[model samples]
Target: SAPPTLWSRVTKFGSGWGFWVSPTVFITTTHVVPTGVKEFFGEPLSSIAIHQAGEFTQFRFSKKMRPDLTGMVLEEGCPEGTVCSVLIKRDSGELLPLAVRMGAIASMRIQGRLVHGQSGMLLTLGTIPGDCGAPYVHKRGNDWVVCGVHAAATKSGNTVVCAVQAGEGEINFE
Candidate 1:
């Protein structure tokens, strides 16, 4: 089965906002700053405003999810065992979006500050909703880079968020 929209699931990660990108790295607002004191983390942490924050790309891009990532086989809407493509734009430039396939993520636990699923959230301009596995672009100066892949939803199929890697925004991890 093909996967759903990459950015769809991540919108909810925002926990009402979106993920915060730092250089090439990114993290959820919750991860960056715990939401409820007793929910996930033991207490509320810091805010993006206090810390040096970065700006997001103004342009919107489109994408699709292929098989391996999605539980649905290709016979549904995507090509045989593959997710079909939907028209999307770049970061208002001539660059094309990154083409990533479906796969399993590495299971690891890090100390200090890390952006995990519960801690992370997706960003969206409007109220369309987040369930698709869309990725958030990591931009630097004038560079459109791939930070992390959008994963699953948060509450229901309606509101969801993205799942970022441990270090997609490392500023120098090509």
Candidate 2:
């Protein structure tokens, strides 16, 4: 079970999705977040009938078009294969929830550079369009923790979730 206002943390990044990584920063994939767009919509949000207003101070994407893979660095090895949920929002203000099984940390070369053990979380489930930027969470003892943001699909048809553990004041790059 998730806590209330979980939806309050989510918003739109163009036609796709995104969620608040912080009180001010919204997390989404650069591939899905559009250019020249600043406003977005979200939940708790009966405030606007079917939409909630959101704007940003800036648009940020990972350098090299890569992703922030180290969302929650729990250990040196990623063999956790735990269950997580990906939350999606509809145009009609509905919600779509998907339960996924965690796989190994995505270790591969991105944008022609090798990045391993960085923080690219892998999901055993496949995702479709508009799923990008959707927030994935893991529930532990009644607390739903935001694990990462959905970025793109793997060649093997799995998922690559972006996580940087924002607010830590530093991002990892190698």
Candidate 3:
């Protein structure tokens, strides 16, 4: 099967060393350097389309808003509507709506475990062989913040898998 976004599908992160340990940066292990290229800027043109809001898409960002993940930061003065999600969980067969801030990526690093459903909401920036450099937003307290760039995820079942698990990689920023 294909991914939600063809370009970003491979960028999903998973469990293990991929999860962000610090609030300042993201780090990657030595396994996720190559896939970054193919997934980030590949020949097949793996890019996702950000859409505008209509009556049915009221929660979407405006089409004119273009925020890139390269060297971006979230500060105290950042405006509202920067990032927020309505999470509907089906626990005990009950559907509930919960608002959660998007995960922030302050840095990048490496890891040992990779799984499925990574980068659930974080943005995918670049893909490096054995490493996938992704961008994720963070939230502290009641406000949302920018964590940093997601570097890479290990390429093993036991290790960090790039994009599937957001916990792996390096925290290269602060």
Candidate 4:
């Protein structure tokens, strides 16, 4: 979840998008922070230093699992009205649902790729510029469960968005 002031679930972090993995845990691409430092913040900021909005309690980088995924812990929790959800369990050839509710579905494929020695599912969706850190969520009964995190994009008619599949401890705190 992101601060309420951010207009949408997607929040800008450096050059990409980021969202909440837990009440206090923020997740984004590993490149966003360093790129953000080089471009906007001017210096590397520790967790206690970088606060985006008044609603956030604390901010700090937690861990980076691979080239495409990183996490930051925030104190307190997600702001009021923030829409946060749990991640669904993963199974082999389970016929999982793709979250096409966030944006348009240009094409859906269940592919695997090695990201810095870590292998995971690659999610491709149609998105715009602001959809980078958007969460790919599936409807579980009545709740929305996050399944992936937006990673990168390619040139298409609009934007071909790529996301790193997220499950359990992969995206949030264990």
Candidate 5:
């Protein structure tokens, strides 16, 4: 009934983007999170909480070590109808709409190195400092089907997004 909420666009202490998959689940680029051995100065010593528009919760990963991606479980579930669905099918070179809390896109491609070599998208939409891990989706009828996750900025300010269809680097606990 209200504006479609930005459900899983969580920030790591206001530093980077994260994708909300469920009320209790979210995903982010591993680089956004800090491991004891390697760290981002802005990230807190503990798991960061989500406080974006239409969201409020705390999250932490069950497993803390991954090479390119990281997943977290929230202390509470996100509101209904806004959580991203990972089951959607994505096609290469297809024109699609993409979005995060602060940006959107009408076209992009399903290729690139920033997205783990080939399992992500090269977006035409430029990214800001905090847009990492924002999921990309294509609207199919009334549903928003997830296609990829925003990972980093490209040389020209565009973003590298990891495709949901690729299972190599992202973790699947279930």
Candidate 6:
């Protein structure tokens, strides 16, 4: 079964958060900060964050467990004005919803100190501390798609930058 959202089982990977890219695999903002530590859930474990910069289009992407979530599958990226929100797993072990609207498309260069690389979407919200790994959800149709990865927020602006999901084939290797 698909998850209600991509961050159902948010793992404590150092100071950042990790989302399930697959039932047995996950990705974290550590792709942007390879220095972050990772610990598995439902048990005691650890993981390595392989910096995918230059290696793939997903530069701010990184690794996880039986996280039964989809690979965003968004062929047509979410357009502006589309309903969206950021999900944050708080210390209370409860997921906090940060309200916001989707902004324009972001790409080419980096947007913040932590969020780097290819294309992404802008939010009318800013990234507070501990918000680096939040999931940017798009309220597409009747389904809620976790279409972006919360990676950076330049305190210089009120908006934030989220890395676009690479969709299904983002991690194809042989």
Pairs that clash in candidate 2 = 69-119, 70-119
Q: Give candidate 5's root-mean-square deviation (CA, Å).
A: 13.1
lDDT by residue for model 6 over 1-174, one digit each (tens)?
A: 224455564555546666554555445564434343343343323333333432121222223345345554432234556656767777667666665566655443453443332233344434567766666665555666665656665456456666664422254459
Candidate 4 Cα outliers beyond 4 Å, as residue runs: 1-8, 34-125, 157-161, 165-174
Off by more than 4 A, model 6: 1-7, 31-64, 67-77, 107-126, 165-174
lDDT of the candidates, in the order given: 0.28, 0.50, 0.26, 0.35, 0.36, 0.51
Each candidate: how many clashes? 29, 2, 77, 3, 2, 3
Give the per-residue lDDT digits (tens) of candidate 2, residues 1-174: 444467756676676777654443455554565555333433222221121111112233322222332222222222247677777676677776666665545445666644332133344335666776777677656555665566555666454544323322244798
Please, what are the lDDT tens digits per residue for candidate 4 over residues 35-63? 32432222234533344321111233443
TM-score of each: 0.24, 0.54, 0.21, 0.39, 0.42, 0.58
Per residue, candidate 5 scores C-alpha lDDT tens digits across 1-174 of 112343323333233455554443455544454345332223343444432211122243333323233232221211122323221112222222343222222223324322231122232244444554555444545544444454445465533434232323344589
lDDT by residue (90-153, candidate 3, tens digit) is 2232222222233332232434332222222322222223223333333456433332223333
Ranking by lDDT: 6, 2, 5, 4, 1, 3
Off by over 4 Å in 1: 1-131, 156-160, 167-174
Q: How many residue-pair clashes does candidate 3 contain?
A: 77
Model 4 lDDT, full chain set: 0.35
Q: Give the winner by TM-score.
A: 6
Candidate 1, 1-174: lDDT as tens digits: 112343322333332223222222223332323334532211122321222221121111122222222321111011112221211223332222332222222222333333243123222221123312334343234433334333333343232223433323234447
Better of 1 and 6 by TM-score: 6
User: Which pairs of residues collide in model 5?
Assistant: 23-77, 23-78
Instruction: Look at candidate 4 and give me any clashing residue pairs.
Output: 1-20, 47-59, 47-60
Ordered from best to worst TM-score, the candidate numbers read 6, 2, 5, 4, 1, 3
